[PDB]
Amino acid sequence: MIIERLVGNLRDLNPLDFSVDHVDLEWFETRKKIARFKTRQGKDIAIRLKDAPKLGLSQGDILFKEEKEIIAVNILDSEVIHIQAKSVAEVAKICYEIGNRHAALYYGESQFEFKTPFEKPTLALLEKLGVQNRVLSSKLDSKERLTVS
Amino acid sequence: MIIERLVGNLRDLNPLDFSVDHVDLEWFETRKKIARFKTRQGKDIAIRLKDAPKLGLSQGDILFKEEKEIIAVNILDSEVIHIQAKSVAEVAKICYEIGNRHAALYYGESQFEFKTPFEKPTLALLEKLGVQNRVLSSKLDSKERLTVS
């Protein structure tokens, strides 16, 4: 059957207690509403999301929950530009320019840290502005994403 | 004759000393390179700018200078949304979203203050995000503009 709605998250736990099967998504698939996926254990699922999270599906988001059986979202690591701004003025410039490119942008671990998917234009852009950055493999969790309205 | 290059600014003064005639520009005309204007005293001028300022023509920028005669840029007041951010995270969100709209954005008088031209979508956007703002008539000087690259 069609999955229309989330059933909480592994964090609003769930001390498991549960047999947890995952749908492993790329960051760029987290804002899908109508899709067909296969879980890590080989089950088919189909979503037609209603009132989907604006940010996208996040790590641990529960799509299916029946007795001890859970299917939850796993977001796969990807190549990420980790940005370190040096001032508020630079945060402003960085976010303005990335917003202008319509590139995804995520909050980092602190006030002046941001994450954006690796693509050569964004990397070129950030060097062109002399902005401190580092490319690492890591997780872009939807819950840290900056919304566009 | 064609004006290709700026001749400094009234600020790198110029204790005047000079008969200053102005070209009165709207903020949205400051990034023109090829144009024909009339000065406040009724002189015709034509620009085909080479190595034009990336930000645009700024207040006091000198286009013409011969003996005591100067023609300089005046930017006219316009309706401006003055934005007051409350945190770095909010600066990030604001600039990201405005960049996404491809709307002009300017640095304000302090770290968390920004200015953007009044248009109803931008105003709607900022209320929609609960962002503190005020509409005033004021000058958008190109030298405070955030660049898009």
Swiss-Prot record, chains A, B:
One of its GO terms (cellular component) is cytoplasm. It comes from the Bacteria. SMART domains: UreE_N. GO terms for molecular function: nickel cation binding; unfolded protein binding. It is found in: Cytoplasm. Keywords: Chaperone, Cytoplasm, Nickel, Nickel insertion, Virulence. One of its GO terms (biological process) is protein folding. Involved in urease metallocenter assembly. Binds nickel. Probably functions as a nickel donor during metallocenter assembly. Belongs to the UreE family. This is Urease accessory protein UreE. It comes from Helicobacter pylori (strain ATCC 700392 / 26695) (Campylobacter pylori). The lineage of its organism: Bacteria, Pseudomonadati, Campylobacterota, Epsilonproteobacteria, Campylobacterales.
